[PDB]
Each structure stands twice: as structure tokens, then as C-alpha cells.
Design a protein around this ligand. Structure first.
Ligand code: QD6
Ligand code: QD6
Ligand code: MG
Ligand code: MG
Lengths: 57, 148, 150, 56
């Protein structure tokens, strides 16, 4: 169930990632890109689960 | 391995053709995408990985292949990306040849593209014991399943 | 038997899903099509026929499946079309199981088409018995492989 | 008998066919649907050959 997050920082159109998911809130998600922790509005983050990979290793 | 694919984009029209080649077999899949973007490539990749075993994809450094959308698809499906053989260039040219041979049989390029993919995968090598690319990939995958 | 497919359309979220099932294996392919038309169905079939051996396709009498565009595709590719008898299953069960999987993973994607392909992925790679079972993707590969050897 | 033709007869939008191809001219195609022979303007006819079938 390892999650990866791809996100955009405010006022920056360049999508970033992969980043680790620390917490997922109602309106915000806490993540870690490299070493920097960030709080991103939920709408600016795509959380991707390795679901397919788990379906048949 | 039965999971190694090479992907690239070619152009014919003024439209974008996304091409995928199963390196071990020569089997190909291609499609005209409305734009040479990561979103289209990612959707293309998700479809491929659901039809065939896709474990590693080799591509160049085009923005569409390095997009976060493709990285997301690969993570979800368990695909390892390698941005590092001319197996794909040999195939993209052969796709263009077949398309030209059959172009008059279809109005739209996308129709001609699928005709060319059909012909390339189903032809069969002339010799004794000859097989088609479609048969080779099925054989490669079939034998891999037995060793499980 | 290694080349028999069933095709039908189902609907979710006001969109059209074209579904194809390899009857002998349970292997499925699906795609959200912009419109439930013969042109879209014919293009879908040409793609399928170039990837898998498609020798006979079974469909109902929907206008998209009876279209000359689909008959043209079948003629070009060498596919025999078998139309059902009005007022008379395998694919309807798949349309139901595809929507089941779609619902389970819907929150993993914004667009339905993304969820559809996720569901196709999961259905073809699952594995029946579990651990010691085989998947639909493996069964169709086995069926075609054995047919090739003969 | 490699070719089959699908066509529109008049301002009827419903495409018709399959029909046998008798001749394809520059501006018209002569075909035979069932037993009736017809001359259809080229733009109202789609000529399809079993080319895919002939490959394997
Ligand atoms: C644009 C077109 N129109 C066609 C056909 C056949 C016919 C009677 N029509 C006319 C027609 C249009 N709507 N209706 C109700 C009838 C085809 C075709 C189908 C199968 C093959 Cl193997 C080759 C061509 C294509 C083809 O495009 C597709 C595959 C449909 C996206 C192409 O690019 O020419
Ligand atoms: C709409 C969308 N946007 C996304 C992702 C991932 C990311 C970083 N973005 C944001 C982004 C970055 N660049 N651009 C132009 C947009 C995805 C996704 C990719 C793979 C999986 Cl397995 C699941 C979702 C989807 C997905 O749609 C697709 C597959 C692209 C047609 C969906 O329906 O959500
Ligand atoms: Mg390139
Ligand atoms: Mg129906």
C-alpha cells in the first residue's frame, strides 16, 4: 500500500514528484519531496497507489 | 524478458503516432493521439499494461514520457522506466512503410495506422517454421507463465 | 474457440463503454468511446483484431454493431459476425463485473476512462483460485499458444 | 471476390451493402447488391478489400 504523490506548488505550474505521503487531510496533504516536507491543498495533489502492481507481482 | 517494451512518438499528415514495440518479439502497438502529451501517453500506457505484461518501458527524454502522468501510471501498474538498440527505429520505419502501402484503403490516418499494425503483427515470416510477431509474443509470454 | 469474442456497450456516468470479452478465457478489453456509433465500434474492432486473433464476433443488433462500418472492418480483417436473436449473457456478466471493479477503484482517477482501464487491468491480471489460480490474461495466452502449436 | 462495396443509393442517409464490385470508374462505381445492378457516384461508395484476411 505504498503511496506516491505528484503535486504543484502554489503559483507554480510545473508538476512535481514523486513525493512520499505523510498525511492526507480533508483540505490538505502533508508530503515529503526528497527531504523537504510540504503541505499542499488537496486539490493540488495527485495521490497514486501501487494498486495494479499489488494485483499480480 | 517478456515484459520489456520500447515506446516512442513518430509523425505523419501532421498527426502524432505513439508507437510501442515488444522488443523480444517485434510485436507492435500504435495509435494516433490528439496531442503529444503526457496525459495521452499515460492513458496509452495504462491500456497497454492491462493487455500485455509491461514490466519495463524504454523511451527517450521526450517531455511526454518524462511527465508526472506517466510516472504515476508506471507506479500504479508497477512499470520500471528506462530513459537509456534500434529496435524501435527499425519498427517506426516499418510502420510508416506499411501505412503508405495501405493508405488508399482508408480515409483517416488513424484507420491506416491500425491496418498497418494489423498487417505487421499477423504477417508471418516466410520460411519453414516461420511465425508472425503476434505469435512470437504469445509464445514468449506463454513459456514465461509455465516457469512460475 | 480461440478466436470467439463477444462485444456489447454499457453505460456509466452518462458515457458509453465498449466492452469486448474473449469468451473462452474471460479476458476483456474496454474503452470509453465518444459516441455509441458504428464508426467508433469499427475502429475499436480493427485495433482489437490487430492485437488478438479475432475470427468471430458476437453482438446484439444495436445500430453500432449492424453498421456498414463494422461490416467493412470484419470483411477487411476476415472476421465472421454473428448477430444475436432478438429477445434471447457472458458479456452482460462482464459488463456487471467491470462496473463492480470500476466502482472499487473509481476514487483512484478523475476520469471514468482511467478507471475503466484500471478495471480492465485488474480483471485480466487478478487470478481465479488465488495464489495457485490463473488469470484471464494467462488463460487467453495459453489458449492462443496451444492453438499456435497445432 | 476480394472486394465488397458499401454505398448510399440516394439522399437516404442509411448506408447500404455489402455489394459486389463490377467496375470502379473515375467518377462512378458499378455494383450489384443482391440481384440489382447499380451505378453509384464514387463519393457515395466505400470499396473494401479483404486485405487483412489475406495476411495470414
Ligand atoms: C471514415 C470511414 N467511413 C466508412 C467506412 C466504411 C463505410 C461503409 N463508411 C461510410 C459510413 C460512415 N458512417 N456510416 C454509418 C457509414 C470506413 C472503414 C471501415 C473499416 C475499414 Cl477495414 C476501412 C474503412 C471509414 C474509416 O474510418 C473509420 C474506421 C470508420 C474510423 C476510414 O478511415 O476510411
Ligand atoms: C487527469 C489526470 N491527471 C494527472 C494524473 C497524474 C498526474 C500527476 N496528473 C496531473 C497532470 C500532470 N500533467 N498534466 C497535463 C496533468 C492522472 C493519472 C495517471 C495515472 C494513474 Cl494510474 C491514475 C491517474 C490523471 C488521470 O487521467 C489520465 C490517465 C491522465 C487520462 C485521471 O483520470 O485521474
Ligand atoms: Mg521521441
Ligand atoms: Mg446491448
Amino acid at each position: 500500500q505504498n503511496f506516491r504523490v505528484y503535486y504543484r506548488d502554489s503559483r507554480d505550474p510545473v508538476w512535481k514528484g514523486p513525493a512520499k505521503l505523510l498525511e492526507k487531510g480533508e483540505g490538505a496533504v502533508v508530503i515529503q519531496d526528497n527531504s523537504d516536507i510540504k503541505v499542499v491543498p488537496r486539490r493540488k495533489a495527485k495521490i497514486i497507489r501501487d494498486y495494479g502492481k499489488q494485483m499480480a507481482g | 524478458s517478456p515484459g520489456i517494451w520500447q515506446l516512442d512518438c513518430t509523425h505523419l499528415e501532421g498527426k502524432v503516432i505513439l508507437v510501442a514495440v515488444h522488443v523480444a518479439s517485434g510485436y507492435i502497438e500504435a495509435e494516433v493521439i490528439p496531442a503529444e502529451t503526457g496525459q495521452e501517453t499515460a492513458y496509452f500506457l495504462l491500456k497497454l499494461a492491462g493487455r500485455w505484461p509491461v514490466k519495463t518501458v524504454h523511451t527517450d527524454n521526450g517531455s511526454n514520457f518524462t511527465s508526472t502522468t506517466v510516472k504515476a501510471a508506471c507506479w500504479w501498474a508497477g512499470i520500471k522506466q528506462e530513459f537509456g538498440q534500434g529496435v524501435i527505429e527499425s519498427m517506426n520505419k516499418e510502420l510508416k512503410k506499411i501505412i503508405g502501402q495501405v493508405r488508399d484503403q482508408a480515409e483517416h490516418l488513424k484507420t491506416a495506422v491500425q491496418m498497418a499494425v494489423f498487417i505487421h503483427n499477423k504477417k508471418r515470416k516466410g520460411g519453414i517454421g516461420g511465425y508472425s510477431a503476434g505469435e512470437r509474443i504469445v509464445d514468449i509470454i506463454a513459456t514465461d507463465i509455465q516457469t512460475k
